[PDB]
Amino acid sequence: GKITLYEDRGFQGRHYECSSDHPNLQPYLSRCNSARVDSGCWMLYEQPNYSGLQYFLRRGDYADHQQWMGLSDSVRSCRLIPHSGSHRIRLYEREDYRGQMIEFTEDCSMLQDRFRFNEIHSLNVLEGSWVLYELSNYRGRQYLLMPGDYRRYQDWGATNARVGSLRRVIDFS
Template sequence: MLPSIAVAASPWCPRCSGKASASPATALSVAAITSLRTPLLLDDGTVMTSMESADDAEDPKEDAPEPRRQIIFYEDRNFQGRSHESSSDCSELNSYFSRCNSIRVENGNWMIYERPNYTGQQYFVKRGEYPDCQHWSGLSDSIRSCRLIPQHHGSFRIRIYEREDFRGQVMEFTEDCPHVNEEFNYHDIHSCNVLEGHWIFFEQPNYRGRQYYLKTGEYRRFTDWGAMNARVGSFRRISDLY
């Protein structure tokens, strides 16, 4: 609703229709009022302040830029020694450092790998500080590749199968599962289909042991997610936002 605006009216005249009329100097259309940008002094001393047009009010604001994803590797413990920063996937880290004993994640969710080309032991790290390899459950100081996990804002769905090639008993999950055997009645998962989101398989219950990153897609056998056997004790969603 537009604010009321005082305008100076002409004196009443018997020869007119009996209605007061606005003088030409103060007769303003609605369009002129809504497009006004600077204060205006009317004949009767009233000051009209600037107003924002409807077009300006409806203009969408530009999306704020997303924060930069960054992970920093250090050769020595407690963030000492030579370091290397990465902001995207890297299949070969050998040329940047010879060992890794501490990590600082400035932003993002990452999988780090014991060997080049995203192979070997896998470890999930998120924003935070890891002063030694035990803080990411590492077994050695060898980190040779890293992968940035895309952020997922939607729902999560995964189907697990008793046998390879999506055969045998099947169950669908939308939440974390700390004990696969209790829910699925099997200790092993031989194939799976990740329908939505990003997940991590753990070799042991309660999210312990070897880790395996799974993005959306089909996994016809356990070797497709980098495992040496079909044992999966638990799994969880990667739902950490950044």
């Protein structure tokens, strides 16, 4: 799809349009305080090369970085998350796909209501892309998951295994 990132709030100031992954927005955008997501699902990153804090944006209007739960106006790379028509993920109690496992094909806002573990230590993203959230109801630190193996929580960019919720990356329109 396409996303337009603006240096000032309210879709004001200098801006830059992306249609694909961009690993270093720094020459083209000195800060980001609003965004318009016309189409697609996007992950914004605080640092270049898809690192630092992550923020999931779907289509729609974001007049402040707080509306994507952004903690600062730093946005220095972004990913266009490939569309998927189906979603399936396996979440594991322990590293390397060991221990008890819970499987999802739908969103889960309250992981601890379905799984009696505060942590997920590995997971397997069989179908579609997801966003994993530190806290229930899609809050806290966010980690983009794309199809593939995640043998350790460090493989999704986390410094611990805390998980409270997870959502499918779906374009709503």
